[PDB]
């Protein structure tokens, strides 16, 4: 029906983290392949991060946002899309400071937005 | 006793269904009556406290309970006021009958006894009323204006009586004295008729935040010492002299209520059983 | 009693309407103020309208409950009359019900509670008007 | 220690449960009231068999394990040394006052307030009585009920409902003699009361032995004034002692 | 494969129960309506709500209720004949017949044959009929007295009706001014019922005292006849008297009075002269029916006695109901 | 915890059933033995197979059989008094008292008080004794009681009939045990005694009605008087009881 409280943020993290764990090994020239069981018993052995998530069914809306943001990347840039989801999943995978330390997301978001201005300058 | 045949189960079946309709409509009595939520089958929901509108939107299926619904319509046609007070009075008389029937009293003796209380009851209310002149358009203006202030719009039997359940206390007080002079089963049957009237002011006191018992218990002493002027004043939140507050109602409302309610109780008491035809 | 529907009475009906209004408030409680957190709105089709504005949430919030719909009708009164403060209204009204419901458990009639809240709003508007600053 | 399986019940559910036990002891003895009372077949632990209607002997053999009922028996142990005759009248009246009190608990009266109401009415009754001495056969109970009913109107407080209940409870003794005699109790109750007002002011009793008529003064059936004074006093004192108990705690065996 | 697929047969053990249980049920259905203090009854057809109504007429209750039992249909048809033909006694016939079968079921339990029961009831009905004939009082002269009797008989027929509050061949406003058609329809029915017995009273000026006087007088003659009779006929005739005594017992029970006291007092009254005592529903005691002004026609009580005995006689003669496969 | 550890108390209707069934059970136990054609009965003790025996004496049946309920002990103890004091009519006392209680149980179901029934039985016992002095005997006493039922107040009339009806069951049981049609013989005696013929009775030898004066059958007056009184007195005790108080076994 609906979700409320700390279950939401920890749930959105596991959804975004799970989508990134699929395509963790789809990075680089020695990328690994993936086996997609079709409903008719068929298989597609693609190794493209965009094609894998396009064919996978997702129930969490957080996963739909991660996938829909990746499609917007492909229209602008046909490369580096797999790096977006992996970094977004790793940045969210640090749930120690998020919930176990009882920090508010505004404290975390202020740090993530401060680092982004520093990451841009360093590059 | 054996009590093989049990036609009394239909009396308790009709009394419970009749008392159920009164217990629901009880809280909506008076200006401070607690509202009620009605939900139509389509999905719409509404809020109201008018007892007449609630009974129509109840979809009553029991025969005995339908008699209280048709009873309330009779009060609207005759008097047009006191629609909710009638159903509350009938529910308490039938609830009081449940105590008398367990004692081994017949419904016919209870029915004939209640008529004697009704006959003496109309004399009690008529004696303590305030006659007025009908040609005097001054009394009719302030009478409807003050009464219309209790209605929704506050800005825009030649007799009168006080409100706040004071007629029910003088009725209940003197009927208990009248029962002491009676003989036979009519004593307990008329006393039970008197105690049933106390449900109205105790309901008004409950809605006004007061204690239901101490309010009617205090007023029964003020009526023994004073007159019917003593009644519950919800505008101020306590007992006050209702004659000074100008909160009155005509005599036909209280008389037609006891008249039509008692006839329904006598009619429901005379039901021995119901037969399903085809 | 036999009827073509269903009925339910008692103090639990007040509690059911209290917990309902309290639920609607929690949907727009964390999104209060300029630092309010965004919230998803999963429509029937599948679209997801993400926003933190309390007024925009209540317009799209669909909870099939009568008590919640009273606060939705209440939102339109505040939006048209002023156009702001709808979020604080639903939150203030929810706490008054959660506190009043506790008084009802202490044998305090709702009529006495309704009378107290009316006088408190009158005096509150007086203390507010006495402590303003003109433009 | 032994908190497991401990008795735990309070509020109206406990008082009504206590009142339920006292009524069983009263209803058991309400039929054995008077000369037309129904006997009670007592079987001893040794296997003996005895039959009698003595109120004192019924309570001594009645080994009720309920604690509230034991207090009803301890009350009667003292009555045998003061009154002697109306041992059933005390228990029957106490059960009547508790039965009428149950109607007041639903109205929202406190047990201690009912206790104060009965103590006030018990003084009105005691004041009115002096006005195998007083006239028995239920004449005193009916006369006291009329005085308590009139004086109840002069009680502007929640004890007014309790004073009225004391009048109706007083009528159970005469109403019980009429039932045990094979007559309509209520019709015989009200007819005697109306005769105490309409026919003549002096008190008149019930003709339980099916003699000529009422007015037990002619039948020479008269009870002691100290008897009736202690009868309704011990009955009220037992009702107050039971109304002022709302917790029976007993540790269970684990 | 004796009786299957709709076709049924009740053996002597069960048909003896089904025959009485069907007839006794119709009696206990409308016995409460007996007397001026009769109890009302609701009638509500299944599947429709507009058929609601309330009444205390024993005839109207039997006309509308459907009956599947054949034993009950005989007792109901025999009652409708009394309503259409005589106009009074529809309830007493149904109650008197059912009370006879109720006692008969206790007799057959004692291994008393139904034919042995019928022999006693035929002799009792003759002695019972002879009692009314001797106690009946005609009025050839004194038209004032005969006119007064018609007024008393009219009140008895109109008792327990809607109107209870207010010279030859017998071929708007409140009720006192003689509101809708339902009031006038029932006004015509009960009034026509009075004209039926009143017209019968002109053709037969004999009258008998009601209120349990006639029923108790006939029951006394049967008990006297039980002294001079063979063995098994005595026990059967004793039940015929008890069935007649149960009529005032029901009139007193419906009114709330102690029926065991009033009815047993009437026995001691009629047993030692005093062939006028009856039930005084006004005060709730025993009084002379002549002084109180209560009386009923002789032909009405005659047909009530005979139609009730003839109805119960048909049920006892039945011992096995046969039901073929319904279409 | 109102009653535990062996002690118990029976309610009104519970003690009512326990009081009448316990007494009525002892009645039907010896009903078959009443009369010269009394049916035999076997008595077999526990743990002693050799104690098997057969008899038809009601006194021998009650002396050896045990009694658990207290109401039954009251009826069995009074039967032993008849066996020791009088020596005859023991079965008549037990059968007559149970028939009185069997009818009293029916009257209590009709909303009739036990004390009102005792008022009728006391009046009925007077008219029955007066009938014996003027004077088979079971029907003469029942005839006087039936006539007394027409000269009594309301509720007492019904109780007198049950007293007469109980006396009429004695020749019914005597005829049933002999195999004859008890309904014809007893109803013929009723029709006889109601109009003269105060000497008729049963003829178990020929199986019909005959004149006891001619046939030479008679019983002592003191025996029948005690059977009437011991039965009504014994039934009065059981009918007067409404609650049974069982104590703890020792
Ligand atoms: N030859 C290589 N050696 C090391 N890293 C590489 C090489 N080729 C690609 N990568 C890394 O793989 C990442 C993904 O590259 P690419 O496949 O072009 O984008 P995407 O995975 O989004 O399609 C880049 O960030 C790049 O750093």
Distance from CA of F41 to the nearest CA of D (A): 28
Residue D38: list chain F partners with CB under 8 A.
114-115, 240-243
Using DSSP bridges, classify how beta strands D39-43 and F241-246 pair: parallel, antiparallel or unpaired: parallel
Region for B250 from its dihedrals, namely left if φ exceeds 0, alpha if ψ lies in -120 to 50, beta otherwise: beta
- Residues of D with a Cβ under 8 Å from any B Cβ are 107-109, 146, 149, 153-158, 160-161, 184, 186-187, 190-191, 193-194, 197-198
Q: For residue E185, with 0-12 CB atoms within 10 Å meaning exposed, 13-18 middle and 19 or more buried, which class applies?
A: exposed
Q: Which long-range contacts (CB under 8 A, 24 or more apart) does B82-85 make?
A: B82/B249, B82/B253, B82/B254, B82/B256, B82/B257, B83/B50, B83/B51, B83/B52, B84/B25, B84/B28, B84/B29, B84/B33, B84/B50, B84/B51, B84/B52, B85/B29, B85/B200, B85/B253, B85/B257
Would you say E325 and E7 are in contact if contact means Cβ atoms under 8 Å apart? yes
CA-based nearest residue to E123, from E227, E215, E12:
E227
Buried-exposed string F8-18: b where 16+ CB fall within 10 A, e elsewhere: bbbeeeebbeb
Which 3-state string (H, E, C) describes C22-49?
A: HHHHHCCCCCCCCCCCCECCECCCCCEC
Which residues face D42 on adjacent strands?
D50, F245
What is the domain class of E8-138+205-325 according to CATH? mainly alpha
List, as one string, the DSSP characters of E134-195. Answer: HH-B--SS-HHHHHHHHHHHHHHHHTTSGGG----------GGG---HHHHHHHHHHHHHHH
- What pairing do the DSSP bridges indicate for beta strands E40-43 and B271-275? parallel
Q: How far is CA B11 from CA B98, D155, E55, F72, in A?
A: 9, 37, 16, 42
Was E89 annotated as part of a binding site?
A: yes
Question: Which residues are within 8 A (CB) of D18 and not within 5 positions of it... i.e. 6 or more apart?
Answer: D68, D242, D245, D248
Residue D234: other Cβ atoms inside 10 A: 23
What backbone phi and psi angles, to 5 degrees, belong to F130? -65, -35
For residue E5, give the DSSP letter: T
Pick B7-132+159-278's CATH classification: 1.10.10.350, 1.10.260.40, 1.10.560.10, 1.10.150.20.
1.10.560.10
Provide the CB-side half-sphere exposure for C23 (13 A, CA).
18
Which ligand 1 atom lies nearest to the CA of residue A50? 23
Distance A25 CA to ligand 1 centre (A): 12
The beta-carbon neighbor of F154 closest among E229, E234, E264 is: E264
Residues constituting chain A:
123
Residue A29 Cβ < 6 Å to ligand 1: yes
Residues of F in contact with E262 (CB under 8 A): 154
Q: What is the spatial distance between Cα D121 and Cα D108, in angstroms, rounded to a whole number?
A: 20
Nearest to B68 by CA among B265, B274, B276: B265
Residue E112 touches partner F, C-beta closer than 8 Å: yes
**B40 neighbors B32 (Cβ within 8 angstroms):** no
Residues in chain F with CB shorter than 8 Å from the CB of D211 are none
Kindly identify which residue of chain F lies nearest to residue E224, measuring between CA atoms.
F194
Phi, psi of F9 (to 5 degrees): -145, 135
Beta carbons of E163 and E187 less than 8 angstroms apart: yes
Breaks (C-N over 2.5 A) in chain B follow: 156
**What is d(CA E181, CA E178) in angstroms, rounded to the nearest whole number?**
14
CB C69 within 8 A of CB C88: no
- Interface size, chain B vs chain D, as Cβ–Cβ contacts under 8 Å: 57
Q: CA B111 → CA B104, C42, E161, distances in Å?
A: 14, 64, 16
CA pair distance E73, E83, nearest whole angstrom: 15
Asked whether the beta carbons of residue F70 and residue D38 sit closer than 8 angstroms, the reply is no
**What is the C-alpha to C-alpha distance for residues E284 and B137, in angstroms, rounded to an integer?**
53
Residue A47 CB–ligand 1 contact under 6 Å: no
CA distances from D247 to D73, D107, E81, E326 (A): 20, 21, 69, 68
D98-135 exposure pattern, b = at least 16 Cβ within 10 A, e = fewer: bbbbeebbeeebebebbbbbbbbbbebbbebbeeeebb
Interface test with F, best of D21, D58, D63, D66 (most F CBs within 10 A): D63
Most B CBs within 10 Å, among D160, D189, D192, D200, to test the B interface: D160
CA distance E43 to E54: 6
**Residues in chain B within 8 Å Cβ distance of C109:** 206-207, 209
SS3 B275: strand
Q: Which residues pair with B160 in a beta bridge?
A: B130, B250
- Please state, in angstroms and rounded to a whole number, the distance separating the CA atoms of residues D173 and D140: 10
Give the max Cα distance, chain B: 66
Instruction: Using DSSP, state whether D32 is helix, strand or coil.
Output: coil
How many CB atoms are closer than 10 A to CB A10? 14
F161: phi then psi, degrees, rounded to nearest 5: -65, -40
- Residues B181, B116: contact at Cβ < 8 Å? no
Beta bridge partners of F245: D42, F9
Task: Give the angle E179-E184-E186 at the CA atoms, nearest 5°.
Answer: 130
Ligand 1 and A80: CB distance under 6 A:
yes
Does the CB of B123 have a partner CB in chain E at under 8 Å? no
Q: Which residues, including other chains, have CB under 8 Å from residue E39's CB and lie 6 or more apart?
A: B7, B107, B270, B271, B272, B273, E32, E33, E56, E254
Interchain CB distance below 8 Å, D186 and B220: no
User: Of the candidates F150, F158, F195, which has its C-beta nearest E227's C-beta?
Assistant: F195
Question: Cβ contacts (< 8 Å) between F181 and chain E: which residues?
Answer: 231
The answer to whether the Cβ–Cβ distance between C5 and B32 falls below 8 Å is no
* Dist CA D114 CA D101 (whole Å): 7
State how far the Cα of F28 lies from the Cα of B188, in Å rounded to an integer: 47
Q: With 0-12 CB in 10 A as exposed, 13-18 as middle and 19+ as buried, what is C66?
A: middle
Alpha carbons B106 and B185: distance in angstroms, whole number: 10
Torsion sign across C-alpha atoms C102, C108, C114, C119: negative
Instruction: List the structure tokens of C87.
Output: 């979020």
Q: How far is the CA of A23 from the centre of ligand 1 (A)?
A: 13
Provide the CB-side half-sphere exposure for A2 (13 A, CA). 14
Rounded to an integer, what distance in angstroms lies between the CA atom of residue E210 and that of residue C89?
A: 80
Task: Give E118 to chain F, closest Cα distance, Å.
Answer: 16
3-state DSSP assignment of residue B102: helix
Q: Is B103 exposed, middle or buried (0-12, 13-18, 19+ CB in 10 A)?
A: exposed
Question: What is the distance between the alpha carbons of residues E296 and E204, in angstroms, rounded to a whole number?
Answer: 12
State which ligand 1 atom lies nearest to the alpha carbon of A80: 22
F224 annotated as ligand-binding:
yes
- Identify which of B66, B271, B276 has the shortest CB distance to residue E40: B271
Q: Measure the CA angle with vertex B5, ends B4 and B11; round to 5°.
A: 130
Question: B271 touching E, CB under 8 A?
Answer: yes
Give me the resolution in angstroms, 1 decimal: 3.1
Rg (CA), chain A: 16
Residue of E204, B275, E217 lying closest to E196 (CA atoms)? E204
The residues near F122 (Cβ < 8 Å, ≥ 6 apart) are: F232
CA distance F152 to E268: 7
Nearest-angstrom CA–CA distance, F96 and F170:
7
Domain residue extents for chain F: 8-248
CA neighbours within 13 Å on the CB side: how many for F61?
A: 22
Alpha-carbon separation of residue F52 from C135, F28, F64, F68 (angstroms): 121, 22, 12, 22
What is the helix (H) or strand (E) element at residue E296, kind and residue range? strand E296-297
Q: How far is CA F193 from the centre of its chain?
A: 21
- Alpha carbons F36 and F178: distance in angstroms, whole number: 8
Out of C1, C9, C111, closest to residue B32 by CB: C111
Residues closing a segment before a gap in chain D (C–N exceeding 2.5 Å):
131, 132
Nearest to D42 by CA among D31, D33, D54: D54
CB–CB of E270/E284 below 8 Å?
no
Residues in chain C: 135
In three-state form (DSSP H/G/I as H, E/B as E, the rest C), the secondary structure along chain F is CCCCCCCEECCHHHHHHHHHHHHHHHHHHCCCCCCCCCCCEEECCCCCHHHCEEECCHHHHHHHCCCCCHHHHHHHHHHHHHHHHHCCCHHHHHHHHHHHHHHHHHHHHCCCCHHHHHHHHHHHHHHHHHHHHHCCHHHHHHHHHHHHCCCCCHHHHHHHHHHHHHHHHHHHHHHHHHCCCHHHHHHHHHHHHCCCCCCEEEECCCCEEEEHHHHCCCCCHHHHHHHHHHHHHHHHHHHHEEEEEECCCC
DSSP state of E35: S
User: Alpha carbon D45 to chain centroid distance?
Assistant: 29
- Cα distances (angstroms) measured from residue B88 to each of B48, B69, B201, F152: 18, 12, 11, 50
Which of E118, E5, E23, E16 lies closest to E70 in space, CA to CA? E23
Task: Report yes or no: D62 and D135 within 8 Å, Cβ to Cβ.
Answer: no
Kindly determine whether residue E256 and residue B276, on different chains, have CB atoms separated by under 8 Å.
Answer: no
CB of A28 shorter than 6 A to ligand 1 = yes
Tell whether residue A11 is among the known ligand binding residues: no
F221 is written with which tokens? 């007056």
Least CB–CB distance from F2: residue in D47, D58, D69: D69
* Distance separating alpha carbons of residues B162 and B184, to the nearest angstrom: 33
Give the integer Cα–Cα distance in Å for D79 and F235.
34
Tell me how far apart the 2 most distant CA atoms of chain A are, in Å.
50
Between the two ends of chain D, the Cα-to-Cα distance in Å is: 10
Q: Which residues of C touch A105 (CB under 8 A)?
A: 37
How many inter-chain contacts (A to C, CB under 8 Å) are there? 9
From CA F212, how far away is CA F192, in angstroms rounded? 13
Q: What is the DSSP string of A49-100?
A: HHHHHHHS---SHHHHHHHHHHHHHHHH-SSSHHHHHHHHHHHHS--IIIII
Mutate to test the pocket of ligand 1, among A28, A75, A90 (most ligand atoms within 8 A of CB): A28
Show the beta-strand stretches assigned E in chain B: 36-39, 45-48, 160-162, 230-233, 238-241, 248-250, 271-275
The SS3 of residue D78 is helix
B178: three-class secondary structure by DSSP: helix
Token representation of residue A22:
């699929």
Q: How was this structure determined?
A: cryo-EM
E52 chain-B contacts, CB cut-off 8 A: 63, 66
Cα(E291)–Cα(E288) distance, integer angstroms = 6
Strand order in the sheet with F8-9: D49-52, D39-43, F241-246, F8-9
3-state SS string for B126-174: HHCCECCCCCCHHHHHHHHHHHHHHCCCCCCCCCEEECCCHHHHHHHHH
Does A72 belong to an annotated binding site? Answer: no
Closest C-alpha among E107, E271, E112 to residue F146? E271
Residue B86 Cα to ligand 1 midpoint, Å, equals 86
- Structurally, at CATH architecture level, domain F8-248 sits in Orthogonal Bundle (1.10)
Q: Is E54 helix (H, G, I), strand (E, B) or coil?
A: strand
Q: What is the CA radius of gyration of chain B?
A: 19
Estimate the crossing angle of helix E231-255 against helix E90-109, to 10 degrees: 130
CB within 8 Å of C76: residues ≥ 6 apart: none
The residues pairing with B38 across neighbouring beta strands, listed in sequence order, are B46
CA neighbours closer than 13 Å in the CB half-sphere of residue E13:
0
Neighbours of E290 (CB within 10 A): 14
Report how far ligand 1's centroid is from the alpha carbon of A122 (Å): 20
- What is the C-alpha separation between D216 and D138, in angstroms, rounded? 9
B273: which chain E residues are within 8 Å (Cβ-Cβ)?
Answer: 29, 32, 39, 41-42
CA-to-CA distance for B114 and E105, rounded, in angstroms? 42
H or E, element range at C88: helix C86-105
**Cβ-based neighbour number of residue D41 at 10 Å:** 25
The closest of E201, E205, E220 to E275, measured between CA atoms, is: E220
Contact E256/B108, CB-based, under 8 Å? yes
Between CA D134 and CA D139, with CA D138 as vertex, the angle to 5 degrees is: 55
User: Does the beta carbon of A27 lie inside 6 Å of ligand 1?
Assistant: yes
- Within a 13 Å sphere around the CA of D173, how many CA atoms are in the beta-carbon half? 28
Question: How far, in Å, are A32, A33, A83 from residue A45 at the CA level?
Answer: 10, 6, 21
Is C101 among the annotated ligand-binding positions? no
DSSP D121-176: HHHHHHHHHH---EETTTHHHHHHHHHHHHHHTT--STHHHHHHHHHHHHTHHHHH
């Amino acid at each position: 029906k609906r979700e409320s409280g700390r279950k939401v943020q920890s749930g959105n993290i596991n959804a975004a983290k799970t989508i990134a764990d699929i395509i963790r090994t789809c990075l680089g020239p020695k990328s690994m392949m993936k086996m997609l069981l079709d409903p008719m018993g068929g298989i597609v052995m693609t190794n493209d991060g965009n094609a894998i998530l396009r064919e996978i069914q997702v129930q969490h809306p957080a996963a739909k946002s991660m996938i829909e943001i990746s499609r917007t990347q492909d229209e602008e840039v046909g490369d580096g899309t797999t790096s977006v989801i992996i970094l977004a999943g790793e940045m969210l995978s640090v749930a120690e400071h998020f919930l176990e330390q009882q920090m508010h997301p505004t404290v975390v978001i202020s740090a993530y937005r401060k680092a982004l201005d520093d990451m841009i300058s360093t590059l | 006793y054996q009590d093989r045949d049990k036609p009394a189960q239909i009396r308790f079946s009709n009394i419970s269904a009749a008392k159920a309709v009164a217990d629901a409509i009880r809280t909506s009595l008076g200006p401070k009556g607690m509202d009620k939520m009605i939900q139509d089958g389509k999905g719409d929901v509404t809020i109201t406290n008018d007892g007449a509108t609630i009974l129509k939107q109840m979809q009553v299926l029991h025969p005995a309970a339908r008699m209280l619904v048709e009873l309330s319509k009779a009060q609207d046609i005759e008097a047009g006021d006191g629609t909710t007070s009638v159903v509350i009075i009938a529910g308490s008389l039938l609830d009081s009958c449940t105590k008398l029937l367990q004692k081994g009293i017949h419904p016919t003796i209870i029915s004939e006894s209640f008529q004697k209380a009704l006959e003496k009851g109309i004399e009690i209310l008529t004696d303590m009323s305030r006659p007025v002149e009908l040609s005097d358009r001054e009394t009719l203006l302030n009478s409807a204006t003050t009464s219309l202030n209790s209605k929704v719009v506050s800005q825009y039997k030649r007799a009168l009586i006080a409100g706040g359940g004071a007629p029910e206390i003088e009725l209940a007080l003197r009927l208990t004295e009248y029962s002491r002079t009676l003989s036979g089963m009519e004593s307990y049957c008329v006393r039970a008729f008197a105690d049933a009237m106390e449900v109205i002011p105790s309901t008004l006191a409950e809605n006004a935040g007061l204690n239901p018992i101490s309010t009617v218990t205090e007023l029964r002493n003020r009526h023994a010492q004073g007159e019917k002027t003593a009644g519950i004043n919800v505008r101020k939140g306590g007992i006050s002299n209702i004659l000074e507050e100008l909160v009155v109602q005509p005599l036909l409302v209280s008389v037609s209520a006891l008249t039509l309610a008692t006839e329904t109780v006598r009619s429901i008491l005379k039901i021995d059983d119901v037969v399903n035809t085809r | 009693l036999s009827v073509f529907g269903d009925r339910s009475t008692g103090e639990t009906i007040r509690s059911q309407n209290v917990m309902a209004a309290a639920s609607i408030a929690n949907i727009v409680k964390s999104s209060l103020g300029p630092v309010g957190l965004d919230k998803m709105l999963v429509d029937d089709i599948g679209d997801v309208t993400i926003t933190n504005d309390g007024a925009t949430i209540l317009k799209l919030l669909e909870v099939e409950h009568p008590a919640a719909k009273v606060l939705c009708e209440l939102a339109d009164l505040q939006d048209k009359e002023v156009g702001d403060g709808t979020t604080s209204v639903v939150i203030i009204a929810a706490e008054l019900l959660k506190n009043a419901d506790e008084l009802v458990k202490q044998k305090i009639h709702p009529t006495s509670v309704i009378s107290g809240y009316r006088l408190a709003c009158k005096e509150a508007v007086r203390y507010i008007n006495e402590n303003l600053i003109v433009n | 220690k032994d908190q497991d399986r401990k008795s735990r019940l309070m509020g109206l559910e406990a008082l009504k449960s206590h009142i339920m036990a006292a009524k069983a002891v009263a209803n058991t003895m309400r039929t054995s009231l008077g000369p037309n009372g129904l006997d009670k077949m007592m079987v001893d632990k040794d296997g003996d068999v005895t039959v009698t209607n003595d109120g004192a002997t019924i309570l001594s053999m009645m080994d009720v394990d309920h604690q509230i009922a034991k207090l009803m028996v301890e009350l009667s142990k003292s009555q045998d040394d003061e009154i002697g005759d109306g041992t059933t009248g005390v228990v029957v009246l106490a059960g009547a006052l508790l039965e009428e009190a149950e109607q007041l608990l639903d109205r929202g009266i406190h047990p201690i307030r009912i206790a104060d109401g009965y103590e006030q009415a018990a003084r009105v009754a005691i004041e009115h009585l002096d006005k195998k001495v007083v006239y028995g056969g239920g004449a005193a109970e009916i006369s006291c009920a009329l005085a308590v009913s009139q004086e109840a109107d002069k009680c502007p407080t929640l004890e007014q409902y309790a004073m009225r209940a004391f009048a109706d409870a007083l009528e159970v003794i005469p109403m019980a003699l009429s039932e045990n005699s094979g007559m309509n109790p209520i019709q015989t109750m009200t007819e005697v009361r109306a005769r105490q007002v309409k026919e003549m002011n002096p008190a008149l009793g019930i003709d339980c032995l099916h003699k000529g008529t009422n007015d037990m003064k002619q039948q020479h059936v008269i009870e002691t004034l100290i008897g009736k004074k202690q009868q309704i006093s011990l009955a009220t004192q037992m009702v107050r002692m039971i109304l002022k108990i709302d917790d029976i705690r007993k540790p269970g065996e684990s | 494969n004796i009786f299957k697929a709709g076709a049924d047969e009740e053996r002597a053990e069960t048909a003896r129960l089904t025959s009485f249980i069907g007839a006794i049920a119709i009696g206990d259905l409308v016995k409460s309506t007996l007397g001026p203090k009769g109890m009302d009854k609701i009638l509500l057809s299944s599947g429709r709500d507009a058929s609601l109504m309330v009444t205390n007429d024993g005839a109207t209750i039997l006309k509308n209720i459907g009956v599947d039992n054949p034993a009950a249909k005989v007792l109901v048809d025999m009652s409708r004949v009394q309503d259409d033909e005589v106009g009074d006694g529809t309830t007493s016939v149904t109650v008197l017949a059912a009370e006879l079968l109720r006692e008969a079921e206790s007799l057959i339990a004692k291994k008393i044959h139904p034919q042995t029961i019928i022999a006693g009831w035929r002799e009792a009905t003759k002695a019972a009929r002879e009692a009314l004939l001797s106690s009946a009082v005609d009025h050839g002269s004194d038209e004032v007295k005969f006119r007064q009797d018609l007024m008393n008989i009219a009140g008895t027929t109109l008792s327990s009706k809607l109107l209870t509050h207010h010279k030859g061949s017998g071929n708007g406003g409140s009720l006192a001014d003689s509101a809708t058609q339902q009031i006038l329809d029932e006004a015509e029915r009960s009034l026509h019922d009075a004209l039926c017995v009143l017209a019968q009273t002109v053709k037969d000026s004999r009258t008998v005292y009601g209120g349990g006087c006639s029923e108790m007088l006939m029951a006394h003659a049967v008990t006297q006849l039980a002294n001079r009779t063979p063995g098994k006929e005595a026990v059967a005739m004793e039940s015929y008297a008890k069935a007649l005594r149960m009529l005032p017992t029901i009139i007193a029970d419906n009114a709330g009075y102690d029926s065991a006291d009033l009815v047993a007092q009437l026995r001691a009254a009629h047993s030692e002269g005093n062939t006028t005592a009856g039930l005084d529903m006004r005060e709730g005691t025993i009084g002379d029916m002549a002084i109180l002004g209560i009386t009923e026609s002789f032909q009405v009580k005659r047909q009530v006695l005979l139609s009730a005995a003839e109805a119960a006689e048909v049920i006892l003669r039945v011992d096995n109901i046969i039901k073929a496969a319904p279409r």
